[PDB]
Design a binder for this molecule. Structure first.
Ligand SMILES: CCn1c2ccc(C[NH2+]C)cc2c2ccc(-c3ccco3)cc21
Ligand SMILES: [Zn+2]
Length: 197
């Protein structure tokens, strides 16, 4: 089956936010609102903001999962390629097969779904630090979009779900991801292609 990607703010007004990092050749992570697409380098920090209009209950969690965007591939599990799953870059918590990691959160849990075999990473939802307006999760993507035997140039989406302590849905948002060597140039190219279209 295919997990839902429907945007759903839910009772708490849940949605994502992204920094404005620009498109310089040196940028390591940059988000395109026009494409709803994050462009990032391999294994580099991707800050994703969480916003709500009202306070959710203790025990609320935030899960991230990748799926293929194209209909002809959506049923295939997104995983790291045959090289990267074996390169011993473990952080001590993430299974080596998982594309998406959370950086710097010892409460992150990694799920291999016993029925769908899909991978996800989930953390407790936390209020913003004192003086901040939102909460940020730092994600890493551990293969290139181009990796042969893995994503193999197929576009993916990341689905972020706000969940209760049982795993029931409270909110959902999503964004496309390209993991690439030059996110700034690729964002500029894809935005210009969109404008020409
Ligand atoms: C989703 C992260 N986030 C926010 C993000 C933005 C804002 C608005 N600021 C102007 C408030 C919150 C917030 C309030 C409570 C909790 C919370 C309580 C228990 C667990 O999580 C989590 C929260
Ligand atoms: Zn790879």
């Amino acid at each position: 089956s295919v997990p839902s990607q429907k945007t759903y703010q839910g009772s708490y007004g849940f949605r994502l936010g992204f920094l404005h990092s620009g498109t310089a050749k040196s940028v390591t992570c940059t988000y395109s609102p026009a494409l709803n697409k994050l462009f990032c380098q391999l294994a580099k920090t991707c800050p994703v903001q969480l916003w709500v209009d009202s306070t959710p209950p203790p025990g609320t969690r935030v899960r991230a999962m990748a799926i293929y965007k194209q209909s002809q591939h959506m049923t295939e599990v997104v995983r790291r390629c045959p090289h990267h799953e074996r390169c011993s870059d473990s952080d001590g918590l993430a299974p080596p097969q998982h594309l998406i990691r959370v950086e710097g959160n010892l409460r992150a849990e990694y799920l291999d779904d016993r029925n769908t075999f899909r991978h996800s990473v989930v953390v407790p939802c936390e209020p913003p630090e004192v003086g901040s307006d939102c909460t940020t999760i730092h994600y890493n993507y551990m293969c290139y979009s181009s990796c042969m035997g893995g994503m193999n140039r197929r576009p993916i989406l990341t689905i972020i779900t706000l969940e209760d302590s049982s795993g029931n849905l409270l909110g959902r948002d999503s964004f496309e991801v390209r993991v690439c060597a030059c996110p700034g140039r690729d964002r500029r190219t894809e935005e210009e292609n969109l404008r020409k279209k």
